Design a protein around this nucleic acid. Structure first.
Ligand code: NCA
Length: 208
DNA sequence: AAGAC
C-alpha cells in the first residue's frame, strides 16, 4: 500500500496551510503552533475561532492540504476584524508528526465518531482525494494536490515547531514588512491587490 | 464567500 510520502509525491503536494488571526503570529513564529489544550496549559495568550470544538480533540492543531478551509476562514474574517494570515507548512508534518486525516471538516458527524486510530495512516490520508466525499463528487479537472472537499482536515496531536513553517502570507505589504523586521530569517509574503485569486479566495474561484 | 452540532 502507498505511504504518506508516496501519496505526497504522486499528487504533487507542496504545501499544508493554517489560517490564523495576525494577533497570534508573533507567538506562533516564536513558539511554533500549539494545540488549544497546550496553549491553555502554558497560559499562552491566543485568539481562537471555535467556541465549541465539536471535533472533540482540543489537543490537536488543525491544518489543510494544498488550500485553506476557505469556508470556515471567510466566516471568521467576517466576524473578527483585523488582519488574517496564512501559514504555509512543510508537507513533512504529515509523516513526521502524529496526524489524523479527515476527508471533511473534523467537526462533521460524518467523520468524528470513527475510532481515531483508523484516521491515522496512509489509508486515511488517501481518502481525502476520493471520487465522492459525503456527497461532494470530485471534479475531473481538479488538480491532484487538492482535496475533494475543501474542508478536508489534518489534526496534529503534537506541537509543530516553527522550523516547519515555510512561509507566511499576509493581506497587505505593511503586515508582511512588520513581521519580516521581527523575523528576518523567515519568508513573509503578501498580496498587493486582494481583488485577485489569492489564498483568501474561495477555492472554486482560485482554480477557475 | 459565512464549519461544525
Ligand atoms: N486554522 C486552520 O487552518 C483550520 C481550522 C479549521 C479547519 N481547517 C483548518
Amino acid at each position: 500500500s502507498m505511504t504518506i510520502q508516496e501519496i505526497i509525491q504522486q499528487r504533487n503536494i507542496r504545501s499544508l496551510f493554517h489560517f490564523t488571526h495576525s494577533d497570534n503570529l508573533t507567538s506562533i513564529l516564536d513558539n511554533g503552533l500549539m494545540s488549544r489544550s497546550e496553549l491553555d496549559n502554558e497560559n499562552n495568550e491566543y485568539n481562537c475561532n471555535d467556541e465549541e470544538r465539536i471535533d472533540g480533540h482540543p489537543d490537536a492543531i488543525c491544518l489543510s492540504v494544498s488550500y485553506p478551509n476557505a469556508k470556515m476562514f471567510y466566516k471568521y474574517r467576517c466576524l473578527k476584524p483585523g488582519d488574517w494570515v496564512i501559514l504555509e507548512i512543510n508537507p513533512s508534518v504529515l509523516w513526521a508528526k502524529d496526524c489524523a486525516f479527515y476527508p471533511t471538516n473534523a467537526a462533521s458527524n460524518n467523520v468524528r465518531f470513527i475510532n481515531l486510530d483508523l484516521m491515522k495512516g496512509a489509508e486515511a490520508f488517501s481518502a481525502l482525494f476520493s471520487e465522492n466525499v459525503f456527497g461532494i463528487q470530485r471534479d475531473v479537472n481538479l488538480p491532484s494536490e487538492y482535496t475533494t472537499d475543501v474542508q478536508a482536515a489534518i489534526l496534529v496531536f503534537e506541537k509543530i515547531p516553527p522550523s516547519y513553517i515555510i512561509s507566511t502570507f499576509h493581506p497587505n505589504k505593511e503586515s508582511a514588512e512588520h513581521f519580516k523586521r521581527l523575523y528576518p530569517q523567515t519568508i513573509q509574503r503578501y498580496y498587493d491587490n486582494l481583488n485577485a485569486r489569492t489564498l483568501y479566495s474561495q477555492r472554486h474561484y482560485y482554480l477557475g
